[PDB]
């Protein structure tokens, strides 16, 4: 009853389009994550399985509500999510 979410958190600058293109696939996930890793102490990039999920509202709600049909949704939440605390790119490797 949990999901696997791996994302990188960075401040909002307007490069959302530059982050997804630079992220391309899991090939540069570490490259963009390390450069966009502004929450290493609070987060390690991946939270693993989450049965409930309680971090904000839209970020989690979507994590547990991610649709199963999507051309680029079975990997990264495209487009990514934009919030007042910066933008976030989540990668789902497991689903409830």
């Amino acid at each position: 009853n949990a999901v696997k979410v791996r994302h990188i958190l960075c401040e909002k600058h307007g490069k959302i389009m530059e982050a997804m293109e630079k992220l391309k696939s899991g090939m540069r996930f570490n490259e963009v994550a390390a450069q966009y890793s502004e929450d290493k102490a609070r987060q390690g990039g991946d939270l693993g399985w989450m049965t409930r999920g309680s971090m904000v509202g839209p970020f989690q709600e979507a994590a547990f509500a991610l649709p199963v049909s999507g051309m680029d949704k079975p990997v990264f939440t495209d487009p990514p999510v934009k919030t007042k605390f910066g933008y976030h790119i989540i990668m789902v490797e497991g689903r409830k």
Side-chain angles (χ1 to χ4, degrees), residues 14-77:
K15 87 284 96 52
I16 285 171
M17 70 190 187
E18 190 184 55
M20 74 185 274
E21 186 184 13
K22 288 261 184 163
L23 183 74
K24 300 198 177 247
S25 61
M27 181 185 79
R28 272 177 186 176
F29 186 74
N30 186 49
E31 291 194 17
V32 178
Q35 299 310 258
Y36 290 1
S37 179
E38 287 299 298
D39 59 16
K40 186 171 148 66
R42 183 168 213 204
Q43 297 176 75
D46 64 340
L47 37 146
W49 292 87
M50 308 305 307
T51 66
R52 285 176 225 212
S54 317
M55 287 185 170
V56 267
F59 185 89
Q60 185 252 7
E61 192 79 321
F64 278 88
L66 177 67
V68 313
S69 73
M71 73 183 219
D72 192 345
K73 289 207 145 64
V75 270
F76 292 109
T77 46

